[PDB]
Amino acid sequence: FVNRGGLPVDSHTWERMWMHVAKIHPDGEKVAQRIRGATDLPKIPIPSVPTFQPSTPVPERLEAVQRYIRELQYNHTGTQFFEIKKSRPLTGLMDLAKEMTKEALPIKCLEAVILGIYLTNSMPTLERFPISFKTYFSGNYFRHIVLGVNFAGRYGALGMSRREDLMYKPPAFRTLSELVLDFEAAYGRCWHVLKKVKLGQSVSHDPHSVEQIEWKHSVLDVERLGRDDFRKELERHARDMRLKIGK
């Protein structure tokens, strides 16, 4: 369920959110009856957007960016509060990122990617690029996206997920392949088989850029490739990104 018309949430989408809750939760209407109109609810502090001293090393800045993303909370309400159109020009997506910092609602993985780009445009020596993972568990396919990053030749990731090992990686992996294989192993530990990886090109650091994010610059079919061809394909993506300069 996606809120397809800004904030405040309109009466129709608001009721649909509560209707949807009543389906999911075993005591779904007991939950609404206790929350809706309640006058004693916690005040939620608006998280402060982190700002960085120039003497602060970038990896320490990334920790603060990821902390801020987590503070918004993963969205378990069943209703997505921001519409993300993935082919929107970057400048429109950055307007959306800013709106997300001003409204401060829970988010999921794709919103966190956009936010990660917005909060690291101030770091021109940081390379940012989306990584999407398609996995398989119990006869079903699952998609997850993170923001891959590269600082001083080391690879890491920012993002949001239900699982702690499927989001933040400090920029410590020497190669892109090592980063991706770290995700594949984390998936295997929770019984998901990794089927595809889709890697985007690096994203411009200009928040007024009209260019689109290219999400699928490399699409890798994991088991059709085999391990050596899989690594070589990732090395090639790493070189392609090095040669696309943008800020």
């Binding site: 904030l7 405040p8 949430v9 608001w14 959110m17 809750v21 999911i24 939760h25 075993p26 939950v31 929350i35 809706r36 309640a38 609810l41 916690p42 005040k43 939620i44 909370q73 993963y74 969205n75 378990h76 309400t77 069943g78 509060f81 409204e103 401060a104 609602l105 829970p106 239900r162």
Partner: peptide, 29 residues
């Protein structure tokens, strides 16, 4: 004037986070 939109957003945001806590609690149990 426009302070009704703000109170609307404030009331909605508080219920959104209360709901998110309950749903988060459920979706691990």
């Amino acid at each position: 004037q426009k302070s009704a939109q703000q109170e609307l957003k404030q009331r909605q945001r508080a219920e959104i986070y209360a709901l998110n806590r309950v749903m988060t609690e459920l979706e691990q149990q």
